[PDB]
Amino acid sequence: ITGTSTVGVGRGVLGDQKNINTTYSTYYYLQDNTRGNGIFTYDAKYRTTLPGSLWADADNQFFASYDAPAVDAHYYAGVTYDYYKNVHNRLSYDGNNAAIRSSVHYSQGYNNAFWNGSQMVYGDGDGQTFIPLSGGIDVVAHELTHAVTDYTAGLIYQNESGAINEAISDIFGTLVEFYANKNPDWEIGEDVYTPGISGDSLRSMSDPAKYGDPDHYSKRYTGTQDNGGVHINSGIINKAAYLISQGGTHYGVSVVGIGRDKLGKIFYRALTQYLTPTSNFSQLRAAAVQSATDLYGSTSQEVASVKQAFDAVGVK
Ligand SMILES: [Ca+2]
Ligand SMILES: [Ca+2]
Ligand SMILES: [Ca+2]
Ligand SMILES: [Ca+2]
Ligand SMILES: [Zn+2]
């Protein structure tokens, strides 16, 4: 809609208060005009019809419990946009400031979130396995990163290339979590998963095998479930990425960590410059070595650590 940019206030899924950019025109809408061609948040009204209605509010105050997932979807999409702009010089997901759209209150008791080719979509959860999924910044950044991948490398959602597609979204979801810097960790979905059980998460990057995911290529899932294990075999790449950043010894191979910022730069370059729709794990290793080489020199510690990290997870 056309109107006047302003700032409202609300409370997110976890009960925290935040300021959100809104637009005023009779109602106040969840439309942030300060970022690219805009961030837009929609109410799907417990249906599966998308996008639903642009979120309208009478008083620019968003403290109702119905409001909470909208507040967080809108706010964390802004943070994710800011991460890509400030850290990687990328304007929105397509690199030309495409408008970012999210719908919340999708369906009834829906325990997931996704990018559907055109926008983000967030379920409310069933209240015991998940609370509303937009409450996790790693989840929001994970979904938006799928749009980035789709506009760059185009990794197909199947088999090894799909596992890479998933790992990239976990990796940047985590980097965005650290960027916003409120209790960042190397776990995925911990803020919105199983409100009744503390200390757990959906997936772990530091130790994928904690939830039964492979942490070595020898343990890869070779069956047909989950599109050939795109959410399972991503553990192998997530572990490699954790080692590149933080360091450690894994299956007897020692890796000197080079830190989060270099991890991000190396993987963003691999993604946007060297990966293709059918890239496999061995091709990712090559893309990542070449990226680190480009950025830091063939005889750097950075290149050395990328090699040891992929050796440690058994990717040659
Ligand atoms: Ca209100
Ligand atoms: Ca966290
Ligand atoms: Ca996390
Ligand atoms: Ca939990
Ligand atoms: Zn994903």
Curated annotation (Swiss-Prot):
Temperature sensitivity of activity: Thermostable.
Subcellular location: Secreted
UniProtKB keywords: Calcium, Hydrolase, Metal-binding, Metalloprotease, Protease, Secreted, Signal, Zinc, Zymogen
Catalysed reaction, written as an equation: Preferential cleavage: Xaa-|-Leu > Xaa-|-Phe
Residues that coordinate or bind Zn(2+): H142, H146, E166
Any Gene Ontology biological process: proteolysis
Cofactor (UniProt): Ca(2+); Zn(2+)
Binding of Ca(2+) 2, residues: D138, E177, D185, E187, E190
Details of cofactor binding: Binds 4 Ca(2+) ions per subunit.
Active site: E143, H231
Residues annotated for Ca(2+) 4 binding in this entry: Y193, T194, I197, D200
Binding site for Ca(2+) 3: E177, N183, D185, E190
Binding site for Ca(2+) 1: D57, D59, Q61
Protein EC: 3.4.24.27
Domain of life: Bacteria
GO MF term (any one): metalloendopeptidase activity
Record bears the keyword Mitochondrion: no
Gene Ontology CC terms, in alphabetical order: extracellular region
Family: Belongs to the peptidase M4 family.
Function, in words: Extracellular zinc metalloprotease.
Name of the protein described by the UniProt record: Thermolysin
Species assigned in the record: Bacillus thermoproteolyticus
Residues of the full protein shown: 233 to 548 of 548
